[PDB]
Amino acid sequence: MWPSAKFIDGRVAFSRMPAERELDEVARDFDAVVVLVEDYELPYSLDEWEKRGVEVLHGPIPDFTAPSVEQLLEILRWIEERVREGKKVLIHCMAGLGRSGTVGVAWLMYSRGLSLREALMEVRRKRPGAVETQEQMEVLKELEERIKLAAALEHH
Ligand SMILES: [Cl-]
């Protein structure tokens, strides 16, 4: 297991950007990768993943910014489809902090129904620093309220 990978359940991890020399290892350990960096941040083409038999969702998010709630939910749905096929999924930004941490917190709230508080404490335990900006934090409250609101519809 790639030591940079920070697992938030048995199948999904977040990390920093693998370097090109790290790709063979990351590919032996993961079947799918959600790449959250922008093109100019990458030091190799995303074909390198394809060549190694790894499925890619490229969901670029400019650094120190936040996805919208709809980008987040799109990423979550794709992660869920792969987990269902028996895959392991790595989510990665550049530093392993704000962007990939924001998605990882979103993954715990969606898949396990934990509060933003409990999810954020789990992600920070694995990587202190994660979720960097207040826009990142805001989108997570936005998502939390939507999750509560959707769970409330199902009760009544
Ligand atoms: Cl919704």
Author numbering: 1 to 156
Publication text:
In this study, we report the crystal structures of three forms of Tk-PTP, which showed that this protein forms a canonical DUSP fold and that it undergoes an atypical temperature-dependent conformational change between two forms. Structural and biochemical analyses revealed that this structural alteration requires the presence of the GG motif in the P-loop, and that Tk-PTP has dual amino acids, Asp63 and Glu132, both functioning as the general acid/base residues. This motif, constituting the phosphate binding loop (or simply called P-loop), contains the catalytic cysteine residue (Cys93) that functions as a nucleophile for dephosphorylation and the conserved arginine residue (Arg99) that anchors the phosphate group of the substrate during the enzyme reaction.
The GG motif within the Tk-PTP P-loop was abolished by this mutation; therefore, it was expected that Tk-PTP(G95A) would have a canonically arranged P-loop, similar to that of Tk-PTP(form II). Intriguingly, the resulting crystal structure of Tk-PTP(G95A) was nearly identical to that of Tk-PTP(form II), especially in terms of the conformation of both P-loop and α4−α5 loop. The P-loop of Tk-PTP(G95A) matched very well with that of Tk-PTP(form II) with RMSDs of 0.16 Å over eight Cα atoms and 0.25 Å over the entire 55 atoms.
